[PDB]
Amino acid sequence: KVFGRCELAAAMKRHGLDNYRGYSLGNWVCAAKFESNFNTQATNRNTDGSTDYGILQINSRWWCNDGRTPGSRNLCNIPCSALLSSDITASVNCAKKIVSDGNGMNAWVAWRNRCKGTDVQAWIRGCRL
């Protein structure tokens, strides 16, 4: 599924991501925009052979099992395919584990290069939340 901007902001909000671990809603919508272009089915293969999955492009080397990343850790306890669902609950629960690691949202390279230090409030502007 491809989310609309305010539709995804509202879904992220209902699942407890606004201000989670100090990151306002809008950091999370900005990260999803540049990671997946709000598409839940987005996949991207990395040079090390691992693959990023879903709306928040969660990596198979540490966080999910895709059966083809030799050496992977599956810390969110879930097949990587569950992260491609139009229900974002799995991606939201795993993202919460990832931001809780000592790095915060710097784990997402597109948040670091194009959301971090920008007016991220713009991503939730006219939405009724």
From Swiss-Prot:
Instruction: Name the domain of life.
Output: Eukaryota
Q: What class of enzyme is it?
A: hydrolase
The family database entries (CDD domains) matched by this protein are listed as: LYZ_C
Q: Which residues form the C-type lysozyme domain?
A: 1-129
Q: Does the keyword Membrane apply?
A: no
Q: Which GO terms describe its biological process?
A: cell wall macromolecule catabolic process; defense response to bacterium; defense response to Gram-negative bacterium; defense response to Gram-positive bacterium; killing of cells of another organism
Reactions catalysed according to its record: Hydrolysis of (1->4)-beta-linkages between N-acetylmuramic acid and N-acetyl-D-glucosamine residues in a peptidoglycan and between N-acetyl-D-glucosamine residues in chitodextrins
Q: Which cysteines are joined by disulfide bonds?
A: 6-127, 30-115, 64-80, 76-94
Q: In which tissues is it expressed?
A: In the egg white and polymorphonuclear leukocytes.
Cell location: Secreted
Q: Which residues bind substrate?
A: 101
Q: According to the UniProt entry, what is the EC number of this protein?
A: 3.2.1.17
Q: Does the keyword Signal apply?
A: yes
Role description: Lysozymes have primarily a bacteriolytic function; those in tissues and body fluids are associated with the monocyte-macrophage system and enhance the activity of immunoagents. Has bacteriolytic activity against M.luteus.
Concerning its family, UniProt says: Belongs to the glycosyl hydrolase 22 family.
One further remark on this entry is: Lysozyme C is capable of both hydrolysis and transglycosylation; it also shows a slight esterase activity. It acts rapidly on both peptide-substituted and unsubstituted peptidoglycan, and slowly on chitin oligosaccharides.
Return the protein name. Lysozyme C
Source species: Gallus gallus (Chicken)
